[PDB]
Amino acid sequence: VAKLRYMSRDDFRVLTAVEMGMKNHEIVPGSLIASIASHGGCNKVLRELVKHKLIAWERTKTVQGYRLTNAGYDYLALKTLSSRQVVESVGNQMGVGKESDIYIVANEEGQQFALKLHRLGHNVSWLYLSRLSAMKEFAYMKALYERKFPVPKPIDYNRHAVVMELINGYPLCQIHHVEDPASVYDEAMELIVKLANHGLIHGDFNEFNLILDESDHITMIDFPQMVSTSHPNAEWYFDRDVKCIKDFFMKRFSYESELFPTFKDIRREDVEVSASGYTKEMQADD
């Protein structure tokens, strides 16, 4: 774990100005950055930001200027989170999600958490989609957590960063021995039904998104592109997830079952409404 690097308020203002300019521009010219930040002082700051790899300079035939980098975007989110006493130090990357990088972080007291940094996207698409990708995850984690789903407890959010409870477990893909394979297989299958019961289909249900703890309990850590059960082709997505689970257990643990669930028999009984509500609340702030 390493403490965040120091930065002056002036440098932070320019870095923030690059981000603001990037909302509607693929490339931000030095002149615009100066206008937003409020000019050979500005150029000094830009030169320092390039050296630190927080921003990058680019030349194209139509326009030339700067853009935020992954590191620069990360710094904005982490500093904001640092200011809220949520994250003070960041460790190394332990893995990835479909659209994200996962890290370990610690607060002031040294209490550890999981940090997910979302990367999705074009420069303007990248800034917008990464932020949106994170918001959706935080919103859905919160909604799923309220209904006692096996997901981490969400702690905080900013931009493309999400901070959640850290599960003491490993991805199912790295697990080669389990106490009872039928037991874990059933937990996963029951999980798929429970999501369908609440109107959701994962769409990426696999050994990579499922984490197994010491007690062999499964926790869902990635849900980027879930499908509604109201979708015209919802059955196919449901069946695909089930087959993926069956495939993995046959390959890894040599376990088979003929009790595969069916989509039509699934009934409904709400997370999407709550999650959309949470998404709307968060959007008001940004």
Smallest separation (angstroms) from ligand 5ZH to the CB of 164: 5
> Looking at beta carbons only, is 125 or 183 nearer to its own copies?
125
For 213-243, b/e burial (b = at least 16 CB within 10 A) is eeeeebbbbbbbebbebeeeebeebbeebbe
Selection from its own copies, ligand 5ZH, none that 166 binds (CB < 5 to 8 A by kind) is ligand 5ZH
Selection from ligand 5ZH, its own copies, none that 170 binds (CB < 5 to 8 A by kind) is ligand 5ZH
Selection from its own copies, ligand 5ZH, none that 284 binds (CB < 5 to 8 A by kind) is its own copies
Q: Which residues bind ligand 5ZH (CB under 6 A)?
A: 94-95, 102, 104, 114, 152, 164, 166-168, 170-171, 211, 221
> Looking at beta carbons only, is 45 or 211 nearer to its own copies?
211
Specify binding-site residues. Answer: 116
Selection from ligand 5ZH, its own copies, none that 171 binds (CB < 5 to 8 A by kind) is ligand 5ZH
Selection from its own copies, ligand 5ZH, none that 272 binds (CB < 5 to 8 A by kind) is its own copies
> Looking at beta carbons only, is 49 or 275 nearer to its own copies?
275
Per-residue H/E/C for the chain: CEECCCCCHHHHHHHHHHHHHCCCCCCECHHHHHHHHCCCCHHHHHHHHHHCCCEEEEECCCCEEEEECHHHHHHHHHHHHHHCCCCCEEEEEEEECCCEEEEEEECCCCCEEEEEEECCCCHHHHHHHHHHHHHHHHHHHHHHHHCCCCCCCEEEEECCEEEECCCCEEEHHHCCCCCCHHHHHHHHHHHHHHHHHCCEECCCCCCCCEEEECCCCEEECCCCCCEECCCCCHHHHHHHHHHHHHHHHHHHHCCCCCCCCCCCCCCCCCHHHHHHHHHHHHHHHC
Q: Which residues bind its own copies (CB under 8 A)?
A: 24, 26, 96, 98, 122, 124-125, 128-129, 132, 206, 208, 225, 228, 232-233, 236, 240, 243-244, 247, 272, 276, 279-280, 283-284
> Looking at beta carbons only, is 109 or 258 nearer to its own copies?
258
The owner of tokens 């904001």 is: 80
> Looking at beta carbons only, is 24 or 254 nearer to its own copies?
24
Spot the catalytic one: 74, 204, 222, 241. Answer: 204
Smallest separation (angstroms) from ligand 5ZH to the CB of 224: 14
**Is 222 labeled as catalytic in the residue annotation?**
no
Smallest separation (angstroms) from its own copies to the CB of 216: 22
Smallest separation (angstroms) from ligand 5ZH to the CB of 271: 19
Rounded CA separation 54/22 (Å): 14
Q: Which residues are catalytic?
A: 204
